Amino acid sequence: ARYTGPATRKSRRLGVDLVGGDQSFEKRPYPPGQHGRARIKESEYRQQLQEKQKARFSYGVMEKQFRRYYEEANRQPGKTGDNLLRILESRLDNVVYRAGLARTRRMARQLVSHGHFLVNGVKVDIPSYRVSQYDIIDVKEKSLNTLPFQIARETAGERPIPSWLQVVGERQRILVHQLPERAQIDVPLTEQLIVELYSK
Amino acid sequence: PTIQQLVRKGRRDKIAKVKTAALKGSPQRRGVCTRVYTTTPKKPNSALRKVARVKLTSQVEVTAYIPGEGHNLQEHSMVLVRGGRVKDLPGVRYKIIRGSLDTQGVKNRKQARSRYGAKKEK
Amino acid sequence: AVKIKLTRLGKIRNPQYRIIVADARTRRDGRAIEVIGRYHPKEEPSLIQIDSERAQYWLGVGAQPTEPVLALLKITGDWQKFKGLPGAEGTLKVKEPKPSKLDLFNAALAEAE
Amino acid sequence: GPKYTPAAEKPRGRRKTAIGYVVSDKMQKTIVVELEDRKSHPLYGKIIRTTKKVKAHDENGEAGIGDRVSLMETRPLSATKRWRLVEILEKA
Amino acid sequence: NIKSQIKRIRTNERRRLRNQSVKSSLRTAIRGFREAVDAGDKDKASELLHATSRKLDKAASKGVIHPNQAANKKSALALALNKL
RNA sequence: CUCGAGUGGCGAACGGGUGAGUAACACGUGGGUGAUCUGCCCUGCACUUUGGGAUAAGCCUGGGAAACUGGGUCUAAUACCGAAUACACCCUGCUGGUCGCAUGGCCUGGUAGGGGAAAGCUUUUGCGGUGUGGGAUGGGCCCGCGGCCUAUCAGCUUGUUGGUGGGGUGAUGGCCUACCAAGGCGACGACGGGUAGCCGGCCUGAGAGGGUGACCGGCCACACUGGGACUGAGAUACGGCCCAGACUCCUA
RNA sequence: AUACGUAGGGUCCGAGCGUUGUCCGGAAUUACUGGGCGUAAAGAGCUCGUAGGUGGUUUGUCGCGUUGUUCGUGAAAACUCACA
Numbered sequence: 001a002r003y004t005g006p007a008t009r010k011s012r013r014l015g016v017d018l019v020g021g022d023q024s025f026e027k028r029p030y031p032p033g034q035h036g037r038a039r040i041k042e043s044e045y046r047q048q049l050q051e052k053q054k055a056r057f058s059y060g061v062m063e064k065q066f067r068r069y070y071e072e073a074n075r076q077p078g079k080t081g082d083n084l085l086r087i088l089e090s091r092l093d094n095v096v097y098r099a100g101l102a103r104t105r106r107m108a109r110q111l112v113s114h115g116h117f118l119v120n121g122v123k124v125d126i127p128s129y130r131v132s133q134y135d136i137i138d139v140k141e142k143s144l145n146t147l148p149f150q151i152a153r154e155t156a157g158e159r160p161i162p163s164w165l166q167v168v169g170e171r172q173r174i175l176v177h178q179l180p181e182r183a184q185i186d187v188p189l190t191e192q193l194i195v196e197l198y199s200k
Numbered sequence: 201p202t203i204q205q206l207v208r209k210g211r212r213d214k215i216a217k218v219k220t221a222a223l224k225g226s227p228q229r230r231g232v233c234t235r236v237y238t239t240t241p242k243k244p245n246s247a248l249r250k251v252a253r254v255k256l257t258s259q260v261e262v263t264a265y266i267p268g269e270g271h272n273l274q275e276h277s278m279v280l281v282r283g284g285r286v287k288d289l290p291g292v293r294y295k296i297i298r299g300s301l302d303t304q305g306v307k308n309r310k311q312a313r314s315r316y317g318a319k320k321e322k
Numbered sequence: 323a324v325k326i327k328l329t330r331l332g333k334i335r336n337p338q339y340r341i342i343v344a345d346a347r348t349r350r351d352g353r354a355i356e357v358i359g360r361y362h363p364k365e366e367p368s369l370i371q372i373d374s375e376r377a378q379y380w381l382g383v384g385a386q387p388t389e390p391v392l393a394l395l396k397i398t399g400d401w402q403k404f405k406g407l408p409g410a411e412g413t414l415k416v417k418e419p420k421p422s423k424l425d426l427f428n429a430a431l432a433e434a435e
Numbered sequence: 436g437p438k439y440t441p442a443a444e445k446p447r448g449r450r451k452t453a454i455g456y457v458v459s460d461k462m463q464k465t466i467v468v469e470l471e472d473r474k475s476h477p478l479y480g481k482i483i484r485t486t487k488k489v490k491a492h493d494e495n496g497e498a499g500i501g502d503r504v505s506l507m508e509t510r511p512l513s514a515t516k517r518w519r520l521v522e523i524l525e526k527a
Numbered sequence: 528n529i530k531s532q533i534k535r536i537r538t539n540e541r542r543r544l545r546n547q548s549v550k551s552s553l554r555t556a557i558r559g560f561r562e563a564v565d566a567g568d569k570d571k572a573s574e575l576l577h578a579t580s581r582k583l584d585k586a587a588s589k590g591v592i593h594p595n596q597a598a599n600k601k602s603a604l605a606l607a608l609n610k611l
Numbered sequence: 612c613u614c615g616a617g618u619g620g621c622g623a624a625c626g627g628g629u630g631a632g633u634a635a636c637a638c639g640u641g642g643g644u645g646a647u648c649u650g651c652c653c654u655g656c657a658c659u660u661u662g663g664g665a666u667a668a669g670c671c672u673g674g675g676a677a678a679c680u681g682g683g684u685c686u687a688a689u690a691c692c693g694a695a696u697a698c699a700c701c702c703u704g705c706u707g708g709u710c711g712c713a714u715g716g717c718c719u720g721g722u723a724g725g726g727g728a729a730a731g732c733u734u735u736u737g738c739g740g741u742g743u744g745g746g747a748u749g750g751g752c753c754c755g756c757g758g759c760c761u762a763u764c765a766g767c768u769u770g771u772u773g774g775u776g777g778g779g780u781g782a783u784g785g786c787c788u789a790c791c792a793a794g795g796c797g798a799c800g801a802c803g804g805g806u807a808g809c810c811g812g813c814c815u816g817a818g819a820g821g822g823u824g825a826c827c828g829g830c831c832a833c834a835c836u837g838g839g840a841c842u843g844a845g846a847u848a849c850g851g852c853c854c855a856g857a858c859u860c861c862u863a
Numbered sequence: 864a865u866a867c868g869u870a871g872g873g874u875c876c877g878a879g880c881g882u883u884g885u886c887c888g889g890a891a892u893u894a895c896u897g898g899g900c901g902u903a904a905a906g907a908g909c910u911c912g913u914a915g916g917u918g919g920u921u922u923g924u925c926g927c928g929u930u931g932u933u934c935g936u937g938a939a940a941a942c943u944c945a946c947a
Binding site: 528529530531532533534535536538539540542543545546573576577579580581582583584585587588590593594595596597598599600601602603604605606608609 | 618619620622623648691701702703704724725726727728742777779780781782840841842843849850851852
Binding site for chain 7: 454471473474475476478480481484
């Protein structure tokens with residue numbers, strides 16, 4: 001369903017920006033706890049586990065929903081590494097986040113929790129919703145007039161909208177065009193390790 | 201190796217190498233425990249481990265271990281025996297679940313908190 | 323004897339039906355000799371798609387549609403062919419036209435710019 | 436219409452017919468015939484070749500030991516005799 | 528166990544009880560024809576075959592014996608006459 | 612009007628259950644039955660003529676603890692029993708033509724002899740009856756082939772095999788039966804012991820392979836146990852029956 | 864005692880989370896794919912030969928095995944592809 005913990009501790013443990021601008025994680029880059037300073041018994045096991053945990057904790061996705069992502073990626077005709085990154089870049093909250101309309105992944109998580117978004121005319125309170133190409137996207141007025149959402153929409157100096165997403169008016173219409181391409185995603189650390197580990 | 205001789209006979213696996221013998225491959229059975237006398241583990245692992253012999257409902261007489269520190273079971277007890285593997289003891293391949301039919305969970309167990317029948321601390 | 327039947331399919335709240343031809347002594351979901359149609363009360367137009375000439379044959383040899391199956395036949399006008407009393411005509415309604423997959427985004431782009 | 440309405444011919448035949456060798460032409464109106472098979476093994480691939488002792492009816496006693504004959508199956512003509520000796524082409 | 532069909536019980540008892548006498552009579556007629564044929568008398572055999580071809584055909588038209596059993600018996604008795 | 616009880620149809624053998632049994636043409640995959648049946652639906656033609664006996668119900672009387680049960684009288688019919696026309700059909704005798712898979716198949720062959728039915732209610736959308744010709748679908752039988760283990764299971768076999776003639780069956784067929792003959796089955800594993808319903812499938816495995824027959828589907832077997840019989844188009848007849856035991860219940 | 868037990872403190876999962884029971888693979892640990900038998904498991908003490916398998920060079924036939932082809936065929940769901 002949904003996780004509980006914040007992102008700073010996981011950022012420190014996995015040693016990567018999970019908030020994106022976590023002041024406290026770069027304050028304490030070592031893993032949390034009395035022995036984040038203490039050196040770890042290094043293993044490629046740890047490398048792959050850290051990679052998958054970064055992937056899970058970056059987007060707000062959670063483990064059981066993540067495993068079926070790999071499985072369906074492997075079922076896809078293309079190489080599993082490509083398909084997994086494509087589909088993880090194909091989530092409803094991900095689609096609305098990359099448009100710069102949500103300041104956090106948890107922003108979009110709680111937004112789809114509340115029901116502040118609309119795809120093709122149908123309201124989907126389900127973050128696990130899949131948004132296809134050429135989908136019509138809109139934002140409801142009750143959230144539109146809300147003050148922090150007004151800040152998010154009007155101060156949208158956040159990360160730029162990728163070429164496969166297009167906010168095309170004041171209605172926050174994200175007229176999606178194509179799939180998230182490998183040459184266009186600009187993804188964090190790759191996922192070939194996940195494919196090789198899960199395939200065994 | 202003489203393909204025709206294969207047609208004559210051959211190609212069987214070696215041996216099942218069975219593990220569980222309570223009955224029915226039961227995820228657990230229940231029965232009456234007795235002979236709860238403590239015996240000795242292996243010499244390098246010098247200690248003493250509390251065990252018992254349980255006649256399960258499966259009509260077989262097996263040897264079960266009593267995990268944890270404290271025990272609640274005594275003679276004529278409805279103990280639930282599960283399969284186990286104790287290399288520390290000779291011929292002991294069973295345990296009794298704590299926080300279950302008869303044996304109360306191990307007192308104040310907190311590192312496991314699911315095993316040893318230690319319920320949630322309020 | 324022989325009867326043309328409606329058999330149930332789909333999940334719980336939304337019913338669907340296949341128009342089959344079968345013996346009475348079977349159950350509702352036995353071996354269909356031939357699937358000759360399909361119908362769904364759940365969908366808007368109760369849309370029906372029927373193999374026509376096989377139904378013509380089976381009516382000829384003496385297939386006896388079930389009461390709602392016969393109702394569906396009339397809803398098609400098929401019973402107006404084997405019996406042919408007024409002649410066969412399109413009697414069933416249809417799903418509304420509805421836009422396409424591409425024209426939706428075409429209109430969205432036109433509205434946007 | 437006509438009082439009498441006709442029927443069909445139900446194209447019929449092809450009763451199993453095979454070449455065998457008469458081997459036990461011993462009992463009255465009775466022969467025993469054998470057949471050959473050559474079948475690839477399901478697992479290994481060593482084509483095995485086996486036989487079968489069918490019992491055939493000879494109303495005429497034409498056959499004899501070790502004759503290359505042909506047989507078509509009939510209706511069951513007795514308890515284990517279901518073959519008709521036709522198209523005889525070798526004796527001895 | 529008793530359920531709303533003892534009427535069927537009585538109906539079947541009646542139906543299987545009439546056929547008892549019917550079959551006894553027909554079998555007695557057939558055995559009589561047998562003594563006629565074995566005795567070597569052809570006129571008595573011909574008349575008994577005629578009467579039985581009437582009787583068993585009636586019984587087959589009635590609900591006592593399947594149509595083809597009657598035809599089988601008719602042919603058998605007819606040949607028994609034809610050769611005596 | 613309505614409808615209990617009653618006669619009489621029809622339905623009830625399907626629809627649901629279980630996997631005990633079964634190692635078997637049981638199932639699946641492909642074919643034959645020239646050796647075959649089908650109430651119900653569809654479709655041709657022809658007929659439906661006519662006479663008579665009985666009963667439930669209804670009512671009276673009688674025995675039995677009950678279970679239940681007898682006698683007397685009456686009851687109508689699409690109920691039953693006499694009989695008549697059928698030739699569309701069947702059986703026989705002969706015989707013409709024709710295709711052959713040998714028995715044989717086709718011409719409702721012909722011929723001649725013989726034989727075989729039915730119904731009322733109801734005005735009411737009318738429903739209904741008989742016989743045959745055909746459809747349809749449901750079937751019944753036989754066979755190719757596929758799929759447990761175990762000689763610390765190698766001989767088994769006399770209605771077993773073949774023929775004959777019959778009885779019987781829907782049809783073939785030691786199916787059964789009288790005679791004749793002695794065959795027939797196996798190391799390509801009989802006959803035995805144990806084991807098990809089986810398949811579409813499902814799951815693992817890269818694949819092969821391996822394990823399962825949950826549920827959803829396809830068939831089969833079985834419905835206190837064991838023997839027997841019934842009917843109907845159709846019966847291991849689960850909520851049909853009798854008989855021999857078990858168990859249980861009631862018991863005059 | 865970072866292995867026990869206790870605390871934080873960390874890992875991960877989450878209305879789940881671990882334990883037991885069973886099957887497949889990993890096992891090539893039945894080796895057809897895909898094993899070996901001097902010393903590690905494995906050549907009977909040695910002969911012949913029934914069954915069986917098994918085959919020299921060359922001529923013609925048959926096309927059973929074998930392959931090529933057309934069609935009937937393998938219910939639906941199965942499972943997958945594609946659409947809703």
